[PDB]
Amino acid sequence: EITFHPAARLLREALGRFATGVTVVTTAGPQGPLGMTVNSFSSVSLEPPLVLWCPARTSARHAAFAEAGAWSVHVLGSEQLETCLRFTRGGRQFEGLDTVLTPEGVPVIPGVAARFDCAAHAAHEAGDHSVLIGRVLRVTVAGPGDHPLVFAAGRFGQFEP
Template identity: 30%
Template sequence: MSETIRNIMRLFPLGIVVVTTKWSDNLVGMTVNTFNSLSLNPPLVMFTADKTKGNDVPFIESNGFIVNFVDDEKIFNTFAFKPIKERFKEAKFFEGLDGIPVLADSYAYMEVKKYKTIDIGDHTIVVGEVINGKIVRDNFSPLVYYNRNYWKLCR
């Protein structure tokens, strides 16, 4: 059934962001296509992290994270495929909430305090409360992830 879910989900366009955190002085960041808003009151957002890869551990063990809204395929690939230690050498960043890195190329970002983590199946749902959000620039062209590729929007 997991193959069936994969084969159908690849035909469903999803938004993508990079979530970052600081985990006992290590800078952590990963590309996710499971980010979504969850509640407006309180202001909650969420993503899911793969337990089988240990992707959830830094987000369970730290107090918050940053959601980086990025429109650059290269950055998404860096934060999905490059070794963890190389990721922040390639991407420019500055410090946000609790010293968590904010990717400087983001067109918007949210500073988020951990609210709850939910252990479910082979993933952990990471829920956070948005403390601050900023639109950095107006000229951006968001990408969506569809059929194992990044696509630009047009109409």
């Protein structure tokens, strides 16, 4: 056991000890669909139904997500690494993907384990990222719920119950 004070490799390693799923959050941008892969999602409230996620303020897409009225969180299954990588920095994004929209105009990705279609609810700055809180208006689930894509200790993998 070792202790240090933040001040950068060591901090990233430590924060990576918290296991997560992987989400792609999408929105209609000023000149086309946009998405961003994050793992900073949390389920926040049941009544009302609220969730949060944290866009990087160092992304050129940050402003579009901060200004959006509507955005959708996609929880990926373990077979969807390619979708994850598309919406990482430097990935293909929606290039080659079918345009499919929600009733509110949000671009979405078919066939994810869960999609939460959200209305913007609150936003707060938080250092090098923002915290966006959304109200869930619609939920879509597909397939079994117990095969998530998991990211932990810097690696992709699976959940073993």
